[PDB]
């Protein structure tokens, strides 16, 4: 005990000195992890320029066009899109408004295209099988868009990052239907100055018959 006493004289007073380890809101942390219960809990405790690009993609038609002369055939040298020489930095992460959102990593200004919506091209019938099959297996995320009312664009399996845009009935982005070279494309412009690492928003316009946005002046449902 006298051995433990000389460890105790160190270990009593300095635990009121070394333990300045209080940073949190201090929730119910009295239980130990030794029984290893699951505790399914929905408790959320986390947080909640373009010059070079345009010259970069200018070098790609300064290279690819020299030796495409007879053939010719698409093979991925077919301009290797349009509507890509303007895309943006934008990334995806854990969203404040849902699982996954899209964020402007650059202070994009008022009316400036971010990203075209990419995916499959499927008609209205085959959409309705897919709209029910995914929900029949319970995906529970509607990744279909509308170009002209007898064809949709699917983004569940294939597609570009542009699916990851969430909803907010107080919008910041909208998606006009601009055609390039004789098919429609779904390009997604902006409405306001979007900050750096700000969340990108949208109206989905589900016409006609639950908004987890947590913003006040918005219809609670969709």
């Amino acid at each position: 005990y006298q051995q433990i006493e000389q460890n105790g004289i160190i270990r009593d007073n300095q635990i009121a000195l070394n333990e300045k380890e209080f940073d949190s809101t201090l929730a119910s942390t009295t239980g130990s992890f030794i029984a290893e219960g699951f505790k399914k809990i929905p408790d959320k405790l986390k947080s909640s320029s373009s010059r070079l690009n345009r010259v970069f993609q200018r070098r790609f038609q300064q290279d690819i066009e020299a030796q495409r002369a007879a053939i010719g055939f698409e093979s991925d040298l077919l301009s290797l899109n349009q509507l890509t020489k303007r895309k943006k930095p934008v990334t995806f992460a854990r969203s404040a408004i849902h699982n996954w959102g899209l964020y402007a990593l650059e202070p994009i200004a008022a009316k400036e295209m971010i990203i075209e919506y990419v995916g499959e091209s499927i008609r209205q019938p085959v959409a309705e099988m897919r709209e029910k099959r995914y929900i029949k297996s319970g995906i529970g995320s509607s990744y279909l868009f509308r170009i002209d009312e007898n064809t949709v664009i699917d983004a569940t399996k294939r597609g570009g990052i542009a699916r990851f845009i969430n909803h907010c009935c107080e919008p910041s982005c909208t998606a006009k239907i601009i055609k390039v070279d004789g098919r429609k494309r779904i390009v997604i412009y902006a409405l306001r100055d979007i900050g750096t690492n700000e969340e990108l928003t949208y109206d989905y316009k589900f016409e006609r018959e639950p908004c987890l946005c947590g913003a006040p002046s918005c219809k609670g449902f969709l």
Binding site: L144, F145, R146, V152, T174, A175, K205, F206
Partner: peptide
């Protein structure tokens, strides 16, 4: 219904 859309 749940298909996203522009202008309707």
């Amino acid at each position: 219904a749940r298909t996203m859309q522009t202008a309707r």
